Nucleic acid binder design. Sequence first.
RNA 1: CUAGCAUUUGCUGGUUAUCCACUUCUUAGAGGGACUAUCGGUUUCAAGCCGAUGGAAGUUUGAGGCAAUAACAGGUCUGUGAUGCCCUUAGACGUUCUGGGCCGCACGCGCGCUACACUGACGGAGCCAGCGAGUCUAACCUUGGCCGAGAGGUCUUGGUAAUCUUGUGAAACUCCGUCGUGCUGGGGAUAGAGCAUUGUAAUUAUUGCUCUUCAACGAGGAAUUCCUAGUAAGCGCAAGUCAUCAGC
Lengths: 143, 60, 115, 141, 49, 103, 107, 54, 70, 56, 145
Amino acid sequence: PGVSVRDVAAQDFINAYASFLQRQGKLEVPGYVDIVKTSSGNEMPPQDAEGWFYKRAASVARHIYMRKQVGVGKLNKLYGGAKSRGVRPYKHIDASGSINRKVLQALEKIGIVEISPKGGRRISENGQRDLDRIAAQTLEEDE
Amino acid sequence: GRVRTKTVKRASKALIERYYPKLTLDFQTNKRLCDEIATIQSKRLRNKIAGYTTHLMKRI
Amino acid sequence: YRGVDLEKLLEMSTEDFVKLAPARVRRRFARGMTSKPAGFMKKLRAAKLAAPENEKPAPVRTHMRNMIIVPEMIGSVVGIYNGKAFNQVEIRPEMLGHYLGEFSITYTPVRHGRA
Amino acid sequence: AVPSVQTFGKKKSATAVAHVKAGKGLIKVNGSPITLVEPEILRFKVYEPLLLVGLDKFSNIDIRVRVTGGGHVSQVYAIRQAIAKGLVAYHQKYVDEQSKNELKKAFTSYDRTLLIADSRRPEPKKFGGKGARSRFQKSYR
Amino acid sequence: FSHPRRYGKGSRQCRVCSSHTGLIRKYGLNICRQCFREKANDIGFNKFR
Amino acid sequence: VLTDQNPIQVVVDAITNTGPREDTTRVGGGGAARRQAVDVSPLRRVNQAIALLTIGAREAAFRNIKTIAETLAEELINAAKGSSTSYAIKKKDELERVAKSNR
Amino acid sequence: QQQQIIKIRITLTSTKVKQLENVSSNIVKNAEQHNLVKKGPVRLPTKVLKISTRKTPNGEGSKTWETYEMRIHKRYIDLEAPVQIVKRITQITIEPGVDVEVVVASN
Amino acid sequence: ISKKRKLVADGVFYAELNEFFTRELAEEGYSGVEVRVTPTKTEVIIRATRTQDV
Amino acid sequence: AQHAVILDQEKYDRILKEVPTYRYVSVSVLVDRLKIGGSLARIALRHLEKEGIIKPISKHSKQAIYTRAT
Amino acid sequence: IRRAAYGVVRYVMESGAKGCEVVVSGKLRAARAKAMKFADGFLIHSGQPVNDFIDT
Amino acid sequence: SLVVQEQGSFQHILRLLNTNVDGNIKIVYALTTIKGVGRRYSNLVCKKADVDLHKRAGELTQEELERIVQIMQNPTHYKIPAWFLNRQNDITDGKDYHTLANNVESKLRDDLERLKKIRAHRGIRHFWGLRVRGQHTKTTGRRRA
RNA sequence: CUAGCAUUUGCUGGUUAUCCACUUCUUAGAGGGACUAUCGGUUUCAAGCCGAUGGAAGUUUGAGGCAAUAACAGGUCUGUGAUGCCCUUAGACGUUCUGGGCCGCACGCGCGCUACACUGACGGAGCCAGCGAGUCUAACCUUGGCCGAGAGGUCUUGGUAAUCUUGUGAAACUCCGUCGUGCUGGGGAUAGAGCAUUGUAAUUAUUGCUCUUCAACGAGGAAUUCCUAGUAAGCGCAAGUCAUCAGC
Ligand SMILES: [Zn+2]
């Protein structure tokens, strides 16, 4: 049938379409990788280590598909959780601005995403193909 | 609780004295009558008046 | 001071010293100095020039506790106002990049018990 | 044109606007199936509209829901009743009443009480405490 | 005979009485909280709930 | 998995077994207070049963490797069997014994 | 030149609902009387300006607060009309405490 | 200027006027004031008892 | 209670013998009865599952519940 | 005071007024201050009708 | 993935940079017993040493251990940014360092003694055993310990 | 109109006036609706109360606002060009400038924030509110792009606002991972070094960010506070103050 990203679960899509991108290895990893922790309001950096940037691009792909025209600021806000201020009470802190920007550039080089007018990054026509292809694949994968 | 004040219980007795002919043992028609014959400013009080009026008519 | 030896520090321009200094020092100089700092620097220079060989220069009094210690000031005696007195401090090399106010306590230590 | 009903539901600030049609048999949410409800437990509370009534009536109706406002568990309950009001508003117009009452009978007799809005709104915080009823701690001594 | 007065409580004073303390700036009122309650209904701020 | 019985039935049996039949109330007559034995209403039995089970399970899970799901399952199974290992049964029997002493 | 039909938005703002409804009703009725194309009075959400102060002018007493409200009611009416008729409609409906703005729609 | 700011400023205009006339027209017996904002002009009406020697 | 940090051959052989006998199998059961590490216990369960010795009833991120393969 | 207060109260109450009140507070010849009231007729105190009818 | 290990290979106690490290703990946390090494630093060092983060500290080969120590001592050489180091632009030399082990307790002492010698307000407060960062001392810090 | 998946028309999205038609959802303007309605119990068969069924709702329908006669030597002369008297009035107790102080610490009390962990911390992923406020001659809320580990920087743009910020993609929570009962990876005080931001000025750390340092505290004695349904409690957000600064 006419499968979409929406017809598959969001967890199993990201796990599959991450495993797509890292295996072929066409994606541009930034160089920071082992250093950075992905938010101001994170304590430690990611536990996955060999990966994670692939999972982020797998999210941002799925996210930009469904929404109309997202930017970096909206992505910052999306991923960025609540900082423990030790002894003060918590508050929402927006996530790392560069690393979400490097993902938007990384997905543009493959051509999953493109630069939209009226600001932000819309999903591309080759994007829709690639995401709908893995969507139909991931549906038929599990039984 | 639901205990009615003087103005409810007073004006109910005052209507029934004049219009025991006319009025029924049913709320809906009574409230619509109370608009014409009595000149009430409020809407909520009218529904209170007519409700006790019905309680007395049930006893009669 | 951050590698640079003292002979070199004394020859260095204020601008080049600022490049080596902490963020707060840099930001202050980048915002500009008013006429009041410049007048004080002129007085320090005059006092240092008028000093006999091997004597400490005459103490220059200032209310500017917010002034930063620059290499040019080394060896000068500065009377730093604490709120009621001008305390006298000689600008040693170790004091570079600090505020004048740090070397003049505004309050008297709290001693409990003892009459 | 095809038959159309524009039913809705609500709990708290959630407002789940359903659209039912003469369809093939899709029961959609936002733009995704009923298995796309990430509240793992509260899958079964948006199931109940189509479970406890009859499968057969859900074989010719395109239900799809556009949920806005509220919070995660208020989304579940808003959708639910917009489904369970959708078929009843469909069966009102283009089906027999004696059938349409067996929808309402089978629903309301389960201790469902879909009703409409569960009318419980938040009681305002008033000055002198962190809550509505709760007051700041008093000192005495 | 004067010093910076661009921001802070020294800049902003009440229209009515010239007090710095307890100002209401919201909606560009610049009336001290006391004076506001005096001239609240006159302005058009009426209590309801 | 542990009883091969309908676990809803086990919960019901646990609640019926842990509900105290007699309790003591504090009665005082101008200064001094004694305990008086009194009968417990069915709604109170159900309320106390549920409270005792959930408190016992929570204390057993506090600073222990066992999860709250496991300790609650253990507490319910023990209560359904009427085992004196259960916190809820121990407390019910303690209350009834104290009631009998202040009759 | 005068007969050129212009698309115009009349915006009505007021604190007093009764006056604002009267003015709004009069504009709509006058537009009907002259057979003008009208998009009717769109009621915008009422802006509630809220100021919360301490009741007391000093420190004393229970910490009691007063909340004052000013309610701003806003409406707009879109009309397609020649310039002459528009000037006539606006002048007739000046009621004290109703603010009336007229915007010519240039795309 | 915004409508939230403008209506509030017309409020403070009234309030400044009311307090002005109160102490100015003390002897002349000032009741109150009302203002009618038109496009061109701004009408004002000093209501007062002693309307002769005002 | 003592808890294992390294796997250890004698403990491995005990896991294989004892875990199929247990009617209820979870992370806690291994820790209590087999003086094992909590995270050795999670690895052990994933191994025994792969070998088909134990059947999963319920898999949650925080709680995994297994039975013996009857 | 009493001539002045009763003076004004009666002037109000004559011309159509359903009720009236006058309170005078402060120092008046004595050191300690006092608050005399000069009510007449009928007036309500609570609710929305205050805003409608009574002029403070 | 149960894989049995020989009992001779595992080191229960490792001695690193003059500190005793527990072999039973995962490497990333084991290394935090070393003064100057925190969780984020340890993680970075392990990733730069190409050591698995899931391994226990007692399973480390001597070669892996030496590589960890070298990376800890000379972090700038292994492309660790200056901003990640614990002592940036040292006041004596102008160079970036990451003080470790005992050096910490020393470098701390040195920083203070400097402030005491200078007679800076902060140094004087440290001398008197008072809080230095503008904290209100009327209510706070009432028990020494 | 157009893009992909799929052939079965489809299913899932762009293009907010290319356009038409509706007003269910949304807005707010008139009106309606609830009166304990109707029935069954229980009482001076009164006021009422309790049960059951309808109903949007049956605890004054939920919450406030307004709130009598009066009082108090309650608080406020440091809100006021509201004010009596007294004091002071050029070396001022007027005013203004510089710097300090209000924060100063053996200690006693009050409101709070964060905690003591496995119902938890940590990492990835999922991903949902409502009330707000916002600059014209002023520097206000800020999108998008680009630089930065981060804090921030920077080039432009929308918005005088149901339009733009903003769907304020808030937090807890939800899933799949990582730890394993140890002051532990719980806890984040104290402390060192560095890099930004606001400001004439940050030293007696304004504040934020990075690394490092990693204390007490293993559920709190005598006492004692708040609280009966969308309530208690958990949870974050806006506003006020605000150049900057929230544990309020
Ligand atoms: Zn004022």
